[PDB]
Design a binder for this molecule. Structure first.
Ligand SMILES: CCC/C=C/C=C/C/C=C/CCCCCCCCCC(=O)SCCNC(=O)CCNC(=O)[C@H](O)C(C)(C)COP(=O)(O)OP(=O)(O)OC[C@H]1O[C@@H](n2cnc3c(N)ncnc32)[C@H](O)[C@@H]1OP(=O)(O)O
Ligand SMILES: CCC(=O)SCCNC(=O)CCNC(=O)[C@H](O)C(C)(C)COP(=O)(O)OP(=O)(O)OC[C@H]1O[C@@H](n2cnc3c(N)ncnc32)[C@H](O)[C@@H]1OP(=O)(O)O
Ligand SMILES: Nc1ncnc2c1ncn2[C@@H]1O[C@H](COP(=O)(O)OP(=O)(O)OP(=O)(O)O)[C@@H](O)[C@H]1O
Ligand SMILES: *C(=O)CCCC[C@@H]1SC[C@@H]2NC(=O)N[C@@H]21
Ligand SMILES: [Mg+2]
Lengths: 135, 404, 344, 70, 592, 129, 19, 18
C-alpha cells in the first residue's frame, strides 16, 4: 500500500534477485515505479529455478522415476536449462518491466537523471477522505 | 447433399448460422475444461466459479464480460490447452437492487492460477468498479501465479494490487475466500476492505507447507497453516468465518446492506418512524432492562452485547471479526434506520483491557467506517491497557497509537 | 450569431443564410447564382450549416419542443425522464432483431430498422439528417433517460465515413458530452472514404476531430457492432481502446484492419495480372478463409477488445443494464487545464 | 382521459364487496412518500470531505456538478 | 414391398401426424427439416431426422435430390409426402418410384391426369358426374368467351387449367368485364404457371363447398369414408370445416357418394384423396376437382367415421386390399378450426412471430394437432398454420357448444391468430343456421361476416396509461376471488410516491418511421418492407421506372407481396436476384 | 413439484388433468395428476395408440405410474390372446413383472363490516400499493 | 362512507388497519 | 375510477383513509 500510494518520484535498481510476490512489493513497474533499471546480475522470475522446474516438468520427473532413471541428474539438467533460459533480467526487459539493463556504474547517472526530472510529478489518485491501509 | 441431424451445423455463411455458432461458443463456456471437472467439484461438495456468482447476485442480473477470452502463452506447451475464460469469470450485476462488479476465480483451470489474460480480465472489472463508483466483490481461489507464464503474471499481479490501492477508500471492496489462495493471491484480499472465509474449505498462505518444511523443518498441514480459524483467531486477517458458502454469501449481502456504493453517495437508510415525545416519555421496557444491567461490584463482568443489542434497532447487529481480539466488539447496526458502527469494550475478555490485537481490530474498523461516512458509537468500559512484557516487546505503544 | 448556436432550424423557401448576396457576388466576381444555389435551406443543410429544414414555422416550433424534450435546462441540471420502465421482458420486437441483418456482406439495409427496435420506443429523434447522410446522429431514450445515438447508415455510401459524417459526429459528440447524455454507438462501416476529392476535402483533419471528440467526451460510452468494423471505422466508432466503456458485438460482426476484398487486392497485386485463373481461384480461396478467420468477432472477443458477443434480441435490455451501471461514471484521471486542443 | 385505473381483471363483485375492497386498499395505500418539503441542505455534504488534487477533473465533474445541480 | 422405415418429406402438423401414424404402425419414422425447422416438434417426435439445410422451401423441401438423399442415407424404404410441396408433383412421384422406394400416394399418371383440370373434366364427364354449364374444352379467345356468355349467360368465370391454391380464377358479372379479365388471367397464368390454357364456365354467386373423403385401392375397391363441408373460406382457402356435411338432402348425399366412387373408378385412382364439389342455393351439385393427396381436413372424418385415414394409406401402399368394405356411417358431428398466424382484424394477413405461449384446449371432445409448442418461432418462409383444433359432439348444436368452450379455453400469445374469428363464428347466427340451412358460403367471411376483431398489438403500450407499470395481485373479499391490477403510480387516500423523480408520461411512438408522406421513400433506395423471398424481379439494371411500377415480388408466408417504385427515376444498383432471401429494410435498388 | 408436464396430444387421445407445469402436490389429496384416454376402432389399434401416447407423455419433478403404464401396454399377459387375457384384480400384485427402476410468506387479513355484511378481506402479505 | 357506483355504503374498519 | 372487466365504475371515498 505505501509504495503504490506514494506519489513522489520512485526509482528502482534491481541487483540480483527479484522473485515472486516480492518483485511486486519491491518497486515493480506496474505498481507505478517511475524508473526501473537492472544490473546485469539481476534475476527476475516467478520463483527460484529449483521450485519452478519441479513443477513445470512434473510429467518428465514422474515418468523418469517410473522408468527408474537418474532423476537427480535429470533435475539438474532441467534446472540448468531453466536458469540459463528464464532467470535473467532480459525476460523482464523484453516485457518492458525493466526500462534499461545497465552497467552498474551507470546507476548514479540514471538515478540522478530521474530525480532531477521527476521533482514535480503530475499524478493523482481518485478523490477520497483517506485510504484504508491494512492495519 | 443431406446431412444427419446430430452432425449438421447451420451454415455459418448465414446470419442464422453465425447466431448458432454464438450459441455453441456460449454453451462451451459453462464447462470450459469439460463436465468431468464440474462433476468433480460438485462431488467435492463445492459450487463452481459460475454458480458462486449466480448464487450471490440477484437472479438474472448478471452480465458476463470477456466470456470467450483465451490465454496467448506459448511457453512449456500451454498453447495446447486454451480453456475459454482463462479460468476467471468476470462481470457485473445487482445485489438487493444495487449494482456491483464481481469476479470469481475458477480453481479447475490450471488450479485457478493467474495468467496474463486472467489478470487483464480482473483489471478490466476493477477499473469498471472504480470508474462507476460501485462495490467490487472478488471470489478468490488460486494456486498463485501460473508458473509457465513468465514474469508477465507478476506484472498482472502488480497491476491488480495497484488497482486495489487506488480503489482503497473509494468503493467498498469485499473478498470472499473459498479455496486455497496461494502466493500473490493473498495480497489482493488483504488490500480489500472485508475478508470472508469458509471455515474448512478455504485457506490463505504465501509460502506452502513444503517450502516451510524445507526451510524450517516445521511440518504443518495447509489447514493449520492457512485455515480460516488460523486467520481469524491468530493472524487477524479474516473478518468472517462462514459455516458454508451460502452463509458467506448471506454475510456479504448483510455487509453490503450497510455500506454506501461509494465514498460520496448517501448511505442506505431504512424508513423508520420516530415516535413523538421526550426521551423520558418514550422509554420501553427493553430500555428499562438497562437500569439493572451493571453489577454492583466494579469488577464483576457483564456481556456488552446486552447493551449493543438493546440500543440497536431490532437487536440486529452484524459483528465483524467476532472471533478475533474478543476483548473488543466491533460491527454494524442501525439506529432509527441509520447505519452505525459500534465499537465496544467487552468486559468478559481481559476484563475489557485494550491490547495490541484489539487496538488494530478497532482501528481498522473505525477507519473503514470513516471512509464511508458511517457514524461510530463507542461503548466504553476499559480499565486500562493489558499489562505485560509480551505487550511491551510486541509494540503496544506503536500499535495502540493506531486507535488514537 | 446563429452559427454559434447548437441547433439551426430553417423554413424551406423562406429561410436563407449567406454572407454575400448574389448582387455583390455578381459584380465583384462575375458569377451568376440564385438564392437557392447560394444559401437556400436545403443547400445549407447538405453543407451542414443548418440542422433541420421544415416546411412551416409551426413544424419548426414543434421540432424545437421535441428537441428540448431530450435536454436538461443547462450544463448542471438533469433532463426529464419520459416513460421509464416500459417493456421489461424480451418482446417480439426484440426477437425480430435476430434476423434483421441480411445474410450476404455486400447487401445493405436501413439502420433505422435496428435503431427503432433497440431503444425504448420509436422516438428516435434525428438531427442533421441531410448533412453527411452516411451517419445518423439522433436522440433516443433508454429506460426513460435520453441518450445520443451515433450510428452508421449502410443504406448510404456503404456507410463509409465521409468528411461531413466525420464533422457531424464530432459536433454531436461534443454537444452530448456538454449536456451529459450517454453516447450509444451502432457500428457498421468500412471506415473512412477513399479518394482524392475526400483527401482534398480534409478527411484527415475531420477524422482527427472525430477521434478527438470521442476521446474527449466524459459521458458513458456504450458500443454495439453490427457487421463491419474495419480499420479507422472500428477505432473511431467508440472502440474500447478509445475509452468506450462497454463494447458488444452481434455475431455478424467483422472486426479487422481491412475487409477481405481489400486484403485480396493487396495480396494479388504481388502476382501478375489475373490472366491465369489460378489468380482468380487464389483470390476466392483467400477471401473465404479470411471471412472465416480474420474478419470475425472471435479474435476481438478472444483478446477482450470487445466485452461480449450477444444475441441481437438482448441488445435493448443489455443497454438498460449497462447504462444503469454507468450512470455515475467519473472520467479520470484527467488533468484539468484551460482546454484540450483540437485539430483545426 | 388518460389516467391508469385499478382493474378487477377477474371476478364480478357486488357493490358491498367493491366497497370492502376499496376501503381496504385505500387504507393500505402508502402515505406521503417522497415528501413535498424535502429541503436542500448541502452543509457537510460528502463531496466536500474528499481530498482533491489541485488539478483533479473531479473538481469539475463531481464537486462543482454536485454543488450546482439543482 | 411392405413399408418398414418411412420418411415424411414434410413439416409441421402434418409431419407430426404422419410420424404419429408410423408410431401407431410400429414403423421407423425419419423426418427431414430445413434450417428454420431445426427445433421443430416433429424433429423431436421422429425416430430419426436429417437436415436438408437451405433456408427456403425451394432449396429445402422442394429439392428432389435432397429428399432422395435423405431417404438413401437413412435407409428408409418408403416416402410419404404429406400435403403441399412435392405431394402432387408427379415428376417427384415418378422419381420416388424409380428410385426403388414405396411412394405412399397415388400413381404418377393419375396425378398428372387429375392435375390437368381439363383432363379431369373429361374424366368426370366420362364418369358422368354432374358438371356446371361450361366450356368442354379450352377456349380460344374472348370472342368465344362472350359467345359462351351469351349462349349460357352471366355471371361467368375464367379459370386457369393448372392454377391452384386459390390464385387461378377471375369472374365477370357483365359482358364489358370479359376482355380485360381474359387478358389479365391469360398473362397471369402464363406468369405463375407457364400454362396459359384457360377454360370458362358459369359462376355460382354463393356456393357451398362440399367434398367426399375417398379411399381407393390397388385391388379396385373404393369407399367413401365420409363427407365434409368447407364453405368457410377467407380468400379461396379454408378456415373452418365440418363433418359430416350438414344440411343436405339424402338425394344430394347419395349422389355424392355415388359420383365420387365413379370418378375414382374412371380415374384409376388409388390411395386416399377427395372429390370436391360445389352446391348451389338451387341445390344443384357440380364437380369441382380431385385432390390427389391426404387433405388437411381428414381429422373431422376420422372422428365421425372412425377410420384412421393415414394408416389406411400405409395399408394401400403395402398393396393390401381395403378391410373396410362399405361407406361407414357417422356417429357424431365434428368441426376443425385452422389456427393460422393471421390477423383477422387486419385483413387476414399472415405475420411471423414467436409463440411465447401455446396452451392448447383439452378434455371433452377436443383433439389438438399442433405443429407448434411454446417457444416455437415462425418465420416468413412457410405457411402460417400453427395447429388444428378438432371438436366433436353428438349433434351439431352440442359440437358447437363444445367448440365455444374449447375456443374460449384456447390461448396463443406472441403472434396474431384467427382464434378471435373462430370465437365469433361459433356464435354467429349465420353459421348457427335455422336448423336446416346456413347463410354462410365461400364469400361469406370476406363480405358478410361482421369483422368485429380489433387489430393485434401483442402487449405493446399504445396509449399513455399503458406506460404505467402494473402489479397484479389476488385478493379475496368475502371469500370471492378477485384478480386486481394496481398501477405503480396509483395514489389514493392522499398517497405520494407516484412519478417519484418527476417522471413525464406521454403516448409512446410506434416502432415505425414517421410514415407521413414518406417512410424510407424520401430517399432513392427501395427497401424490402418485410422478410421474404424475392421470387420475381420485375426490372433490370439501368431501367427507367415510374412511381407505382412493380420492382420486385416478395414471397412471405407463401403470400406474394408486390414491392413497388415510390418515385420516378433510373433503377441503379439493383442488388437482388430471383430466389434471394431478403430481410425487412434490405435495400433492393436505388431509383436514381 | 410438477416441474414439467408435456401432455400427449394428437389422434385418438384425450387428457383430463388437474395439474400443469409448475403445479405442486402433497399427501393431503389424491396424488392423482391426470387421466389419459386412448381410443381406436379395435383393442389392438387402441393398444398401438397407447404404446405411442404413453411414450409421448412426459412428466418431471415427481415420480409417476407412467413407466408402469408403458410396461403393461407391452405385456403379452395384457395383450389379448384373441378371446381372453390373463389379468385379474390381483394381477399387478401377484403376476406382473414390476421391474421398473426407482426415481433418482403468510397472506394479510382484515375483518371488515359493510352494512349488514361481514366480510373478511385477505390479500398478499407484501401488498405495496 | 364509501360510494360505489354512487350507491352509498358505510364500512367499519379495524383500529389497526394498515397495509 | 375502478374497472370491472373493463366496465367503468366510479367510486368515491373520503380524501384520506390511511
Ligand atoms: C482537459 C481535457 C482535454 C482532453 C483532450 C483529448 C484529446 C485527445 C484525443 C485523441 C485522438 C485519437 C488519435 C487517433 C486514434 C487512432 C486511430 C488509428 C487507427 C486506424 O484508423 S487504422 C486504419 C487502417 N489501416 C490501413 O489502412 C493501413 C494499410 N492499408 C492502406 O491502404 C494504406 O494506404 C497503405 C499505403 C499503408 C497500404 O500500402 P503499403 O502497405 O504502403 O504498400 P504495399 O503493400 O504495396 O508494400 C508491399 C507489402 O508487402 C510486404 N513487403 C515485402 N517486401 C517489401 C519491400 N521490399 N518493400 C516494401 N514492402 C514489402 C510489406 O508488408 C509491405 O507492406 P508495408 O511495407 O508494411 O507498407
Ligand atoms: C507467487 C505465486 C507463486 O509463486 S505460485 C507457487 C505455488 N504454486 C503451486 O503450484 C504449488 C502450491 N500449490 C499448489 O499448486 C497446489 O496444487 C494447491 C493449490 C495447494 C492445491 O493442490 P491440489 O488441489 O492437490 O492441486 P494439484 O497440485 O494436483 O494441481 C492441480 C492442477 O492445477 C495445476 N496447477 C496448480 N498450481 C499451479 C500453478 N501455480 N501454476 C500452474 N498450474 C498449476 C496442476 O499442474 C494441475 O494441473 P494438471 O492436473 O497437471 O493438468
Ligand atoms: N364454377 C364455380 N362457381 C363458383 N365458384 C367457383 C367455381 N369454381 C371454383 N369456385 C370457387 O373457387 C374456389 C377455389 O376452387 P378452385 O378449384 O378454382 O381452386 P383450388 O381449390 O385452389 O384448387 P386445387 O384444389 O386444384 O388446388 C372454390 O372453393 C369455389 O369457392
Ligand atoms: C406450405 O407451407 C406447406 C403446405 C401447406 C399449404 C398446402 S396447399 C394445398 C393444401 N391445402 C391447404 O390449405 N394447405 C395445404
Ligand atoms: Mg382441392
Amino acid at each position: 500500500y505505501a509504495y503504490g500510494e506514494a506519489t513522489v518520484a520512485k526509482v528502482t535498481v534491481i541487483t540480483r534477485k527479484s522473485y515472486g510476490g516480492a518483485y511486486c512489493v519491491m518497486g515493480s513497474k506496474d505498481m507505478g515505479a517511475d524508473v526501473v533499471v537492472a544490473w546485469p546480475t539481476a534475476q527476475i522470475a516467478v520463483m527460484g529455478a529449483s521450485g519452478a522446474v519441479g513443477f513445470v516438468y512434473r510429467q518428465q520427473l514422474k515418468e523418469a522415476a517410473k522408468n527408474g532413471e537418474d532423476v537427480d541428474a535429470l533435475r539438474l539438467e532441467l534446472q540448468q536449462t531453466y536458469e540459463d533460459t528464464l532467470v535473467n533480467p532480459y525476460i523482464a526487459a523484453e516485457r518492458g518491466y525493466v526500462d534499461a539493463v545497465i552497467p552498474p556504474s551507470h546507476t548514479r547517472g540514471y538515478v540522478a537523471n530521474a530525480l532531477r526530472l521527476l521533482e514535480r510529478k503530475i499524478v493523482q489518485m481518485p478523490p477520497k477522505k483517506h485510504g484504508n491501509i491494512p492495519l | 447433399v443431406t446431412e444427419p441431424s446430430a452432425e449438421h451445423q447451420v451454415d455459418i455463411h448465414t446470419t442464422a448460422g453465425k447466431l448458432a455458432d454464438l450459441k455453441r461458443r456460449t454453451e462451451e463456456t459453462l464447462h470450459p475444461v469439460g463436465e468431468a471437472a464440474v462433476d468433480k467439484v460438485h462431488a467435492k461438495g463445492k459450487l463452481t466459479a459460475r454458480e458462486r456468482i449466480l448464487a450471490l447476485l440477484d437472479e438474472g442480473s448478471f452480465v458476463e464480460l470477456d466470456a470467450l477470452a483465451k490465454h496467448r502463452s506459448t511457453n512449456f506447451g500451454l498453447e495446447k490447452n486454451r480453456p475459454l475464460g482463462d479460468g476467471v469469470i468476470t462481470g457485473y450485476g445487482t445485489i438487493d437492487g444495487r449494482d456491483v462488479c464481481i469476479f470469481s476465480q475458477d480453481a479447475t483451470v490450471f488450479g485457478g492460477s493467474l495468467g496474463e489474460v486472467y489478470g487483464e480480465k480482473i483489471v478490466k472489472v476493477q477499473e469498471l468498479a472504480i470508474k462507476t463508483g460501485r462495490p467490487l466483490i472478488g471470489i478468490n481461489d488460486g494456486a498463485g501465479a501460473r508458473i509457465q507464464e513468465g514474469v508477465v503474471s507478476l506484472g498482472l499481479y502488480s497491476r491488480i494490487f495497484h488497482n486495489n490501492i487506488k480503489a482503497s477508500g473509494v468503493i467498498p471492496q469485499i473478498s470472499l475466500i473459498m479455496g486455497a489462495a496461494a502466493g500473490g493471491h493473498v495480497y489482493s484480499p488483504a488490500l480489500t476492505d472485508f475478508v470472508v472465509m469458509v471455515d474448512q474449505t478455504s485457506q490463505m498462505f504465501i509460502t506452502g507447507p513444503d517450502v516451510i518444511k524445507t526451510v524450517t523443518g516445521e511440518d504443518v498441514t495447509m489447514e493449520e497453516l492457512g485455515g480460516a480459524h488460523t486467520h481469524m483467531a491468530k493472524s487477524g486477517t479474516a473478518h468472517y468465518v462462514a459455516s458454508g458458502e451460502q452463509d458467506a454469501f448471506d454475510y456479504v449481502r448483510d455487509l453490503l446492506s450497510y455500506l454506501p456504493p461509494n465514498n460520496y453517495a448517501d448511505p442506505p437508510l431504512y424508513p423508520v418512524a420516530i415516535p413523538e415525545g421526550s426521551i423520558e416519555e418514550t422509554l420501553t421496557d427493553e430500555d428499562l432492562e438497562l437500569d439493572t444491567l451493571i453489577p454492583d461490584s466494579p469488577n464483576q463482568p457483564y456481556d456488552m452485547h446486552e447493551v449493543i443489542t438493546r440500543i440497536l434497532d431490532d437487536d440486529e447487529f452484524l459483528e465483524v471479526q467476532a472471533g478475533y481480539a474478543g476483548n473488543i466488539v466491533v460491527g454494524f447496526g442501525r439506529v432509527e434506520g441509520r447505519p452505525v458502527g459500534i465499537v465496544a469494550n467487552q468486559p468478559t475478555q481481559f476484563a475489557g483491557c485494550l491490547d495490541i490485537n484489539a487496538s488494530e481490530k478497532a482501528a481498522r474498523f473505525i477507519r473503514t467506517c470513516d471512509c464511508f461516512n458511517i457514524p461510530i458509537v463507542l461503548l466504553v468500559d476499559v480499565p486500562g491497557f493489558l499489562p505485560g512484557t509480551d505487550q511491551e516487546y510486541n509494540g503496544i505503544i506503536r500499535r495502540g497509537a493506531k486507535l488514537l | 450569431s446563429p452559427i454559434q448556436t447548437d441547433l439551426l432550424v430553417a423554413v424551406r423557401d423562406q429561410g436563407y443564410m449567406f454572407i454575400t448576396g448574389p448582387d455583390v457576388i455578381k459584380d465583384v466576381t462575375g458569377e451568376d447564382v440564385t438564392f437557392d444555389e447560394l444559401g437556400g435551406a436545403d443547400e445549407q443543410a447538405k453543407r451542414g450549416n443548418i440542422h433541420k429544414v421544415v416546411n412551416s414555422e409551426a413544424e419548426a416550433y414543434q421540432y424545437v419542443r421535441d428537441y428540448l424534450s431530450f435536454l436538461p435546462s443547462n450544463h448542471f441540471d438533469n433532463p426529464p425522464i419520459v416513460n421509464p420502465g416500459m417493456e421489461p421482458e424480451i418482446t417480439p420486437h426484440d426477437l425480430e432483431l435476430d434476423s434483421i441483418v441480411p445474410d450476404a456482406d455486400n447487401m445493405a439495409y436501413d439502420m433505422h430498422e435496428i435503431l427503432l427496435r433497440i431503444f425504448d420506443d420509436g422516438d428516435v429523434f434525428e438531427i442533421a439528417e441531410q448533412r453527411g447522410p452516411a451517419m445518423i446522429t439522433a436522440f433516443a431514450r433508454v429506460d426513460g433517460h435520453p441518450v445520443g445515438v451515433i450510428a452508421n447508415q449502410p443504406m448510404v455510401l456503404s456507410g463509409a465515413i465521409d468528411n461531413e459524417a466525420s464533422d457531424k459526429a464530432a459536433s454531436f459528440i461534443r454537444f452530448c458530452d456538454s449536456y451529459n447524455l450517454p453516447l450509444v454507438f451502432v457500428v457498421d462501416t468500412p471506415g473512412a472514404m477513399p479518394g482524392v476529392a475526400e483527401e482534398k476535402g480534409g478527411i484527415i483533419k475531420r477524422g482527427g476531430r472525430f477521434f478527438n471528440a470521442i476521446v474527449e467526451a466524459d459521458v458513458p460510452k456504450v458500443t454495439v457492432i453490427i457487421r463491419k468494423a474495419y480499420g479507422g471505422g472500428y477505432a473511431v466508432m467508440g472502440s474500447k481502446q478509445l475509452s468506450a466503456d462497454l463494447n458488444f458485438a452481434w455475431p455478424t460482426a467483422r472486426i479487422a484492419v481491412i475487409g477481405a476484398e481489400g486484403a485480396a487486392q493487396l495480396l494479388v497485386k504481388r502476382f501478375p495480372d489475373p490472366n491465369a485463373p489460378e489468380v482468380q481461384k487464389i483470390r476466392d480461396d483467400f477471401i473465404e478463409g479470411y471471412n472465416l478467420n480474420m474478419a470475425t468477432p472471435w479474435i476481438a472477443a478472444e483478446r477482450g477488445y470487445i466485452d461480449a458477443v450477444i444475441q441481437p434480441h438482448e441488445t435493448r435490455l443489455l443497454l438498460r443494464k449497462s447504462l444503469r451501471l454507468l450512470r455515475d461514471k467519473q472520467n479520470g484521471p484527467k488533468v484539468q487545464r484551460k482546454h484540450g486542443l483540437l485539430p483545426l | 382521459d388518460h389516467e391508469a385505473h385499478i382493474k378487477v381483471l377477474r371476478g364480478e363483485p357486488t357493490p358491498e364487496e367493491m366497497a370492502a375492497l376499496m376501503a381496504v386498499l385505500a387504507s393500505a395505500g402508502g402515505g406521503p412518500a417522497e415528501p413535498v418539503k424535502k429541503e436542500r441542505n448541502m452543509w457537510g455534504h460528502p463531496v466536500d470531505k474528499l481530498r482533491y488534487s489541485v488539478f483533479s477533473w473531479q473538481r469539475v465533474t463531481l464537486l462543482e456538478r454536485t454543488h450546482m445541480r439543482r | 414391398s411392405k413399408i418398414s422405415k418411412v420418411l415424411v418429406a414434410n413439416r409441421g402438423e402434418i409431419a407430426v401426424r404422419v410420424i404419429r401414424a408410423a408410431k401407431d404402425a410400429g414403423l421407423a419414422s425419419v423426418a427431414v427439416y430445413a434450417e428454420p425447422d431445426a427445433d421443430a416438434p416433429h424433429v423431436r417426435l421422429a425416430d430419426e431426422a436429417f437436415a436438408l439445410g437451405g433456408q427456403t422451401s425451394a432449396e429445402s423441401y422442394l429439392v428432389f435430390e435432397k429428399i432422395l438423399d435423405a431417404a438413401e442415407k437413412s435407409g428408409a424404404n418408403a416416402i410419404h409426402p404429406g400435403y403441399g410441396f412435392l405431394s402432387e408433383n408427379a415428376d417427384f412421384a415418378q422419381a420416388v418410384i424409380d428410385a426403388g422406394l414405396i411412394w405412399i400416394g397415388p400413381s404418377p399418371q393419375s396425378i398428372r391426369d387429375l392435375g390437368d383440370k381439363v383432363t379431369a373434366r373429361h374424366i368426370a364427364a366420362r364418369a358422368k358426374a354432374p358438371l356446371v354449364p361450361g366450356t368442354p374444352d379450352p377456349v380460344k379467345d374472348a370472342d368465344e368467351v362472350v359467345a359462351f356468355a351469351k349462349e349460357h349467360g352471366v355471371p361467368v368465370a375464367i379459370k386457369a387449367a393448372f392454377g391452384g391454391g386459390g390464385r387461378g380464377m377471375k369472374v365477370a358479372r357483365t359482358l364489358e368485364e370479359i376482355p380485360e379479365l381474359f387478358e389479365s388471367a391469360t398473362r397471369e397464368a402464363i406468369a405463375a404457371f407457364g400454362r396459359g390454357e384457360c377454360f370458362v364456365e358459369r359462376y355460382l354467386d354463393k356456393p357451398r363447398h362440399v367434398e367426399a373423403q375417398v379411399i381407393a385401392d390397388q385391388h379396385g375397391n373404393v369407399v367413401v369414408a365420409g363427407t365434409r363441408d368447407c364453405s368457410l373460406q377467407r380468400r379461396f382457402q379454408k378456415l373452418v370445416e365440418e363433418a359430416p356435411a350438414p344440411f343436405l338432402t339424402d338425394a344430394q348425399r347419395k349422389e355424392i357418394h355415388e359420383s365420387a366412387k365413379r370418378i375414382c373408378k374412371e380415374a384409376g385412382y388409388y390411395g386416399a384423396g377427395t372429390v370436391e364439389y360445389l352446391v348451389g342455393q338451387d341445390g344443384l351439385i357440380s364437380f369441382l376437382e380431385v385432390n390427389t393427396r391426404l387433405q388437411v381436413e381428414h381429422p373431422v372424418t376420422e372422428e365421425t367415421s372412425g377410420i384412421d385415414l393415414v394408416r389406411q394409406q400405409f395399408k394401400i401402399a403395402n398393396g393390401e386390399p381395403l378391410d373396410i368394405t362399405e361407406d361407414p356411417t357417422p356417429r357424431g358431428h365434428s368441426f376443425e378450426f385452422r389456427i393460422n398466424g393471421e390477423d383477422a382484424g387486419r385483413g387476414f394477413l399472415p405475420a411471423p412471430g414467436p409463440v411465447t405461449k401455446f396452451v392448447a384446449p383439452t378434455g371433452p371432445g377436443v383433439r389438438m394437432d399442433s405443429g407448434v409448442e411454446t417457444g416455437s418461432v415462425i418465420g416468413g418462409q412457410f405457411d402460417s398454420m400453427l395447429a388444428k383444433l378438432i371438436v366433436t359432439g353428438a349433434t351439431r348444436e352440442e359440437a358447437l357448444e363444445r367448440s365455444r368452450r374449447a375456443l374460449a379455453e384456447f390461448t396463443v400469445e406472441g403472434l396474431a391468430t384467427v382464434i378471435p374469428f373462430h370465437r365469433a363464428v361459433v356464435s354467429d347466427p349465420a353459421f348457427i343456421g335455422d336448423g336446416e340451412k346456413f347463410d354462410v358460403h365461400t364469400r361469406w367471411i370476406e363480405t358478410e361476416w361482421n369483422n368485429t376483431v380489433e387489430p393485434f398489438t401483442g402487449g405493446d403500450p399504445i396509449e399513455e396509461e399503458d406506460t404505467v407499470p402494473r402489479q397484479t395481485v389476488v385478493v379475496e373479499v368475502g371469500g370471492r376471488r378477485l384478480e386486481v391490477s394496481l398501477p405503480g403510480d396509483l395514489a389514493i387516500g392522499g398517497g405520494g410516491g407516484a412519478a417519484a423523480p418527476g417522471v413525464v408520461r406521454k403516448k409512446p411512438k410506434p416502432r415505425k418511421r414517421g410514415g407521413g408522406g414518406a417512410k424510407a421513400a424520401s430517399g432513392d433506395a427501395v427497401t424490402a418492407p418485410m422478410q421474404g423471398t424475392v421470387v420475381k424481379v420485375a426490372v433490370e439494371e439501368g431501367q427507367e421506372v415510374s412511381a407505382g411500377d412493380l420492382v420486385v415480388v416478395l414471397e412471405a408466408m407463401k403470400m406474394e407481396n408486390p414491392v413497388t417504385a415510390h418515385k420516378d427515376g433510373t433503377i441503379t444498383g439493383l442488388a437482388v436476384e430471383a430466389g434471394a432471401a431478403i430481410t425487412q429494410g434490405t435495400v433492393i435498388a436505388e431509383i436514381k
